[PDB]
Design a protein around this ligand. Sequence first.
Ligand SMILES: O=C(CO)[C@@H](O)[C@@H](O)[C@@H](O)CO
Ligand SMILES: O=C(CO)[C@@H](O)[C@@H](O)[C@@H](O)CO
Ligand SMILES: OC[C@@H]1O[C@@](O)(CO)[C@@H](O)[C@H]1O
Ligand SMILES: OC[C@@H]1O[C@@](O)(CO)[C@@H](O)[C@H]1O
Ligand SMILES: OC[C@@H]1O[C@](O)(CO)[C@@H](O)[C@H]1O
Ligand SMILES: OC[C@@H]1O[C@](O)(CO)[C@@H](O)[C@H]1O
Ligand SMILES: [Mn+2]
Ligand SMILES: [Mn+2]
Ligand SMILES: [Mn+2]
Ligand SMILES: [Mn+2]
Lengths: 241, 240, 241, 240
Amino acid sequence: TRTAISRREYDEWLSEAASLARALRYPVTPEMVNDSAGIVFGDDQYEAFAHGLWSREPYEVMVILESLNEPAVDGLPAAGAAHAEYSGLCDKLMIVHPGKFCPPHFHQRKTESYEVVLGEMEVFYAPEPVTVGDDDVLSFSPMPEGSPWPEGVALPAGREDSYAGLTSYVRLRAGDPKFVMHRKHLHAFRCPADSPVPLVVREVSTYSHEPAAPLPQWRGLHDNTFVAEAANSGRLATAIA
Amino acid sequence: TRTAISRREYDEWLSEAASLARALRYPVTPEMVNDSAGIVFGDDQYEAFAHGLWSREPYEVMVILESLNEPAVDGLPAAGAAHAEYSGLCDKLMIVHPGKFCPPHFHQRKTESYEVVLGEMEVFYAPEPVTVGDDDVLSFSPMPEGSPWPEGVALPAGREDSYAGLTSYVRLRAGDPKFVMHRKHLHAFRCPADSPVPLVVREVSTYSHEPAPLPQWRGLHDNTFVAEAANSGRLATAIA
Amino acid sequence: TRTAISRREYDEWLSEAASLARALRYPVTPEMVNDSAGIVFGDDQYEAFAHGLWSREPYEVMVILESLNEPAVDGLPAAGAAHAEYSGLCDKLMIVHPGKFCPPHFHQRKTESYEVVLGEMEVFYAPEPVTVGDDDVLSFSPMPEGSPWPEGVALPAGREDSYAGLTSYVRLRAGDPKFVMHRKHLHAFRCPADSPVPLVVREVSTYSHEPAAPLPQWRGLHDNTFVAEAANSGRLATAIA
Amino acid sequence: TRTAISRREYDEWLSEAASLARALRYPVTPEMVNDSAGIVFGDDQYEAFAHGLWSREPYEVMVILESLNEPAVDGLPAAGAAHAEYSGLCDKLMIVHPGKFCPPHFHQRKTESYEVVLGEMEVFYAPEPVTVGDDDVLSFSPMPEGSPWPEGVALPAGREDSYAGLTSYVRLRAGDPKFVMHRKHLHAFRCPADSPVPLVVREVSTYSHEPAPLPQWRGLHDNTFVAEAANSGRLATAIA
Ligand SMILES: O=C(CO)[C@@H](O)[C@@H](O)[C@@H](O)CO
Ligand SMILES: O=C(CO)[C@@H](O)[C@@H](O)[C@@H](O)CO
Ligand SMILES: OC[C@@H]1O[C@@](O)(CO)[C@@H](O)[C@H]1O
Ligand SMILES: OC[C@@H]1O[C@@](O)(CO)[C@@H](O)[C@H]1O
Ligand SMILES: OC[C@@H]1O[C@](O)(CO)[C@@H](O)[C@H]1O
Ligand SMILES: OC[C@@H]1O[C@](O)(CO)[C@@H](O)[C@H]1O
Ligand SMILES: [Mn+2]
Ligand SMILES: [Mn+2]
Ligand SMILES: [Mn+2]
Ligand SMILES: [Mn+2]
């Protein structure tokens, strides 16, 4: 039981993640390795450091290195400023240790894609979208059926049912085609508990609203809704001692 | 003068590009390596294959391995269907050989970004955006001024006048932060002629409208090249 | 039927091989990309370029990029100068296109190891050593039994029986442990004809004698004996037109 | 003062090093990642784990992933058994964190070479070889003169006097040609303290005699460190 992470644990966690990134050729600059790159989804998830990121235990903890989050507003017809928040460009590298997760959530605006760079990624998602904001949406290439869950997945203690609605499953390996996760779709993912290396996946998505705004309606905008209330709150800052 | 590329030249060109991409961990699939991946911008540009891709001669030809081109239309409010074309997600690996260029052009809808993976990238662009229509556009962080062209840049014969307005220059190297090329801006880039390796650059941008997720998107070409030759062409590589 | 390779074919062959090398982080400097890096084992093997290195046809052609060939003579007790030629250090990167081979041969002095960097390597070898020079040799870790040949290997036209004595087989993939090929052992290897990429393997071996000598007895020393007489000769220079 | 490393510290240290190695395509196997891969040169060097491997503090500790250590005795003429110990093949990936060192030492038999894969390497060595015995040795291409030490190098406390004779300095960067360290020469190296990544260097050398291919090779230690502390130690990492 701990409510924070020591400065040594935090620096090591991010230094090694950024080294792996740099090793894998991701464009890492110093500003990217900051106090908000290492995410702990909820105070009860700081417990992940009791034994460490190589304990292979299930926790919702991860590091994100963002190299791009472009509003893509310049040159856009002023008439399109109403939906500009559904567009934009974002490129980030995510690092998840064995058995760890990126918890159940959905985005109202952000549509994302995945590219596994190192290791393997198990994605749990809801094939059917939710309805947020506008009731009249477009449709073109609905999410695929995926597969039933594989046997043997260890879910985080005290948050197992938050995964209840993510019934579809797909395992992505390095070299596999990009996997698209449309906006308003519940999803989550982990690095197999038995992986010899951390999971390194590049996320290419639309603008990432995660609190000089491009547009006035963009200020204080939150685009991440977590199923587990606990993870919803903590995602906004990391307690470093 | 060459008017097409032999099947052998084409397959070696793309096989080697796809291997280089896979060597650099870019997710290449069988379908990404097709007869349209290798682009020749204009019939007069097939002459690049007279001496080959390592002749270090100036021509406008390249390889594009597109791993992603997502409309991102699903879940988007119907209210925004009118401007969805300026959105979407595209991820591609571009391979340009020494001395070769991605010809001068601009996109009305697409905004892009570059990530140099291998070698060096010389970007030529206009810091000021063109004015297609006028319809009051938005601004936030306009294009940086850049620097003047260094000396020694050899342009393709018969196309040199098309780079006139692209007065701004930036040189991107492997490991450099992302460079953004806002829509409506004229631009072009090349692999320095003295480079020991081909330029391998990753493009992350909005949807690439090139030959139906949305009715109005049908038959949409979002690439307008300065040179009419490469403009009215580049729709299909001629392979013999 | 051709007895040489055009300058365009040669430059492209080596430029792309060196780019792959550099891509894979091998230390390539300009002096390494020279007129002797692209090897054609015998005049009858120039035919490989009739259709090209992506034709997937069986030919004994390859590129070698040598980054190190250190005599390791400095500091060595003068009393050991007699066997110094069996030692030394060599590091080279080899690139073999789909279906192509590095022909049957053995070394009197050179002991080598293999590290597959990209693609897969099929090694054909003789578990039993030959006797050259000294009759009283040492022994510690004899070559392993390997496996019988797999079905479906296409051998070069007019040289199939030169492979007759290389009865053992082992398939090496990227990430596999180093494979040691002891001196005086017949061996050869190819890149599977169906590989989507060329085979890139790093060779770490003892000094490579392949015609200011470190020692006088080293001058004009040849340490490569090919089964096929044809490949023995050609290996010394490449006919570039 | 620390006297050992916790099992957790050890496993994280090697797990991360092995992942970095695999990320860089180095052939790592389960058996390469063992309780001896992580080396601490001297009991007073366990203090490096007081603040950790990213404290950028000067200590002599590192990770060695040995993919090869071939005696190359097979097929070698019996006549040369006497000097076989100066031969053989060794391939290992060494991972040194910012500010950390591979302590001053020399090998009587081993000659090595370095290939920087990631980060930068600062090598300190004596251009002149030590004289263990005298037995007329051979020469061909002696060690280059090198340059003087740059300013700013922080040495490990209590060991600084052991780097006195290593007056020559060379800085190797990723992609640089191979650097050779002939046997009998004192040397040491570190990862610059301001480095954003750990130093990843590939060692290609003759056989590494460290804790029976040949009778006389039994119990042979070919590493002689200047500092007695790291000398009489380093035979086994103390893990709690
Ligand atoms: O925009 C790009 C490079 O700036 C390319 O994707 C595009 O120009 C290419 O498709 C050529 O038409
Ligand atoms: O020689 C090496 C680095 O110069 C290492 O292999 C060796 O020093 C190491 O085993 C430490 O004893
Ligand atoms: O690259 C240097 C400058 O660019 C030009 O190549 C533009 O054509 C030359 O005018 C030279 O002045
Ligand atoms: O690194 C710079 C030089 O090396 C030293 O650190 C050697 O201890 C200092 O003497 C300084 O003069
Ligand atoms: O808070 C976790 C968020 O979820 C992700 O979209 C993972 O799918 C990341 O990009 C973060 O923005
Ligand atoms: O001539 C091919 C020789 O054979 C090899 O040993 C391949 O086993 C290369 O290193 C070359 O020296
Ligand atoms: Mn998400
Ligand atoms: Mn463009
Ligand atoms: Mn050989
Ligand atoms: Mn040493």
